[PDB]
Amino acid sequence: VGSLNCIVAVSQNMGIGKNGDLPWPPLRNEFRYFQRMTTTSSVEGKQNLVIMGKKTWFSIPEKNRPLKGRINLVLSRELKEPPQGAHFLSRSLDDALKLTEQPELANKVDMVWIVGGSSVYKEAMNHPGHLKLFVTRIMQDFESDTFFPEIDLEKYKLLPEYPGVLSDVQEEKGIKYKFEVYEKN
Ligand SMILES: NC(=O)C1=CN([C@@H]2O[C@H](COP(=O)(O)OP(=O)(O)OC[C@H]3O[C@@H](n4cnc5c(N)ncnc54)[C@H](OP(=O)(O)O)[C@@H]3O)[C@@H](O)[C@H]2O)C=CC1
Ligand SMILES: COc1ccc(OC)c(/C=C\c2cnc3nc(N)nc(N)c3c2C)c1
Structure with a gap:
């Protein structure tokens, strides 16, 4: 079982959700980036594990559930x-990670991706050790009712670039965004 990673898209005001949906209109190519990052494994035969809260699960359109090519675990x-x-249910991120170490999953899973929401990101950020945050900066404010926590830049570094991640500004439906990767150890 490989690395532990969070992936999020966030508005300028740190918003991730509004009334159980995204604060912004759907950005298909941002979803495609999410898909590629969370699905791709370098180890043949393995799948990545996506961990999410219940509201995040139900925010995904039913035609996309479970997320294809990944093991889906709901908290x-x-x-x-x-x-x-969904494939699995756990009561806490610690229990989900324990499950990844048990024989039913320990040989199936490569990377672990935390895909939201707020409370799950917060629990992941309390995990000691190596953690990457794949943050899509949506470069506008959007009304939100759920937020991503603050990134401690005395603990995390913004990587100047990351292999396979575009550095250039993206735009869809008149909304500009960019991909960032933060790392702590
Ligand atoms: N912009 C982005 O990157 C993303 C946006 N979204 C948006 O954010 C919102 C969904 O996020 P949010 O509201 O934060 O919800 P969550 O997905 O975290 O769902 C909250 C529910 O899941 C359970 N739960 C969540 N965290 C934990 C935990 N650490 N341990 C145990 N159970 C847990 C509980 O369900 P129970 O009550 O059953 O115990 C809790 O009420 C939606 O608006 C969605 O559209 C979501 C993901 C990322
Ligand atoms: C309504 O259409 C869709 C299509 C795919 C979706 O999830 C993949 C969703 C819901 C939430 C969502 C959206 N964007 C994200 N972007 C990044 N980067 N990280 C995340 N964790 C995202 C998640 C989990 C909604």
């Missing part, structure tokens, strides 16, 4: 089985 303390289509 909930109220559900007693995974929501229809």
